[PDB]
Amino acid sequence: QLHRNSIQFTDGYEVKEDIGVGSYSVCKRCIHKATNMEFAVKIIDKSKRDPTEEIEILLRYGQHPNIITLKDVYDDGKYVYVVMELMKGGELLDKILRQKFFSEREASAVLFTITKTVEYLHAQGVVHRDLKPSNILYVDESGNPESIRICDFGFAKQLRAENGLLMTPCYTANFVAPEVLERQGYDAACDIWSLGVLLYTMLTGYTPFANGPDDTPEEILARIGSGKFSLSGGYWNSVSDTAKDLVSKMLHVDPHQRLTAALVLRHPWIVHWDQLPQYQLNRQDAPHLVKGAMAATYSALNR
Numbered sequence: 001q002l003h004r005n006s007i008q009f010t011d012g013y014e015v016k017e018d019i020g021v022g023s024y025s026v027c028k029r030c031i032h033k034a035t036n037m038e039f040a041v042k043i044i045d046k047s048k049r050d051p052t053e054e055i056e057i058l059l060r061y062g063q064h065p066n067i068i069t070l071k072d073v074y075d076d077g078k079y080v081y082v083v084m085e086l087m088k089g090g091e092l093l094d095k096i097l098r099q100k101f102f103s104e105r106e107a108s109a110v111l112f113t114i115t116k117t118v119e120y121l122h123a124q125g126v127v128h129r130d131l132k133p134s135n136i137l138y139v140d141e142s143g144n145p146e147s148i149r150i151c152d153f154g155f156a157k158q159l160r161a162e163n164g165l166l167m168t169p170c171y172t173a174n175f176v177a178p179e180v181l182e183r184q185g186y187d188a189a190c191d192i193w194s195l196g197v198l199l200y201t202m203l204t205g206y207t208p209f210a211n212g213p214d215d216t217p218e219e220i221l222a223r224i225g226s227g228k229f230s231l232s233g234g235y236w237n238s239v240s241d242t243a244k245d246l247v248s249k250m251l252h253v254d255p256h257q258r259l260t261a262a263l264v265l266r267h268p269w270i271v272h273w274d275q276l277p278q279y280q281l282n283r284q285d286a287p288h289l290v291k292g293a294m295a296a297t298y299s300a301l302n303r
C-alpha cells in the first residue's frame with residue numbers, strides 16, 4: 001500500500017536543521033507551511049533501509065499517547081519522508097538526570113508509564129529492538145509522564161506468520177518459523193533488559209555496564225556476560241529494597257528468568273509506589289558522562 005502521488009513533501013513543508021542521528025536516515029526539524037506548525041521528519045533512504053515495517057507499526061500503534069505519533073508521510077521515489085511529532089521536552093533520561101529533586105515514587109511513575117506502553121506492544125506481537133534511552137523523549141517540558149514518547153521505530157518488528165500474516169503471542173497455531181518464536185521471545189525480554197538499564201541509571205546516575213564513553217567494548221560486553229551489577233553501597237544505600245529487587249530481574253541475565261513487561265507492572269514497586277520514598281536520590285551526577293557511557297554500551301552490542 002505504498003506508494004507515490006502528485007503532492008510532494010516539499011510542497012507542504014519547509015525543511016530545517018538536522019535534529020539527530022542517523023544510520024539509514026536523517027531526522028530534521030520542519031514546519032507545516034500551511035499552519036506554520038512544528039513537526040519532525042525522518043528521511044529514510046529506500047536504497048538502504050525499508051520503512052515498511054516501521055511505518056506500518058506507527059500507523060496502527062501511533063494512536064497510543066505515549067508512543068510517538070505519526071502525523072504525515074510521503075515517498076518521492078528516492079527517499080521516504082516520515083513526519084512524526086517533534087519532541088520539545090528533550091531526552092527523558094537526560095532531563096530526569098539533571099533533576100536534583102527526584103524521588104522513587106517519581107521514578108516509579110515514569111517507568112510505569114513506559115512499561116505499560118511496552119506491555120501493550122508486547123501483546124500486539126511487536127518488539128522495538130532498540131530501547132536505548134535516546135529513543136525515549138519528552139514531547140514537552142511539562143515533565144508529566146503523559147508527555148513521554150517512545151520513538152525511532154526503524155529497528156522494530158511485527159510478529160508475522162511464515163505465511164506473512166499478522167499474529168499475536170496469544171494465537172499460536174497459524175504457522176511461523178520456529179526461530180521466530182525464539183527471536184521474538186528474546187527481543188521482548190531484550191526490551192526489558194534495556195528498561196533495566198534505564199531504572200538502574202535513574203536511581204543512581206551511572207549506567208551498570210559502563211562508566212564512561214571510553215570503556216572498552218570487551219569490558220562492557222564482559223561485565224554483561226556476568227551481570228552481578230552492584231545494588232548495594234554508594235548510590236544504592238538510601239534506595240529501596242523493592243526497586244533494587246526490581247532492577248535485578250529486569251536486568252537478569254537469562255532472557256527467560258528475566259522479567260516480562262507484564263510482570264514488571266505487577267511488581268510491588270510499580271503498584272505499591274505510594275509506600276515509596278518521596279525524597280531525593282543521592283545520585284552521581286554526570287548527565288553528559290552517563291549519556292556517553294550508554295552510547296559506548298550499545299555500540300558494543302550492535303557492532
Ligand SMILES: */C(=C(/C#N)C(N)=O)c1cccc(-c2cn[nH]c2)c1
Nearest residue numbers: 019020021022027040085086087152
Ligand atoms: C531520528 C533518528 C534518530 N535517532 C532516526 N534515524 O530515527 C530522530 C532523531 C532525534 C529526534 C527525533 C524526533 C522525533 N520526534 N521528535 C524528535 C527523531
Ligand code: NA
Nearest residue numbers: 064065067069
Ligand atoms: Na501517540
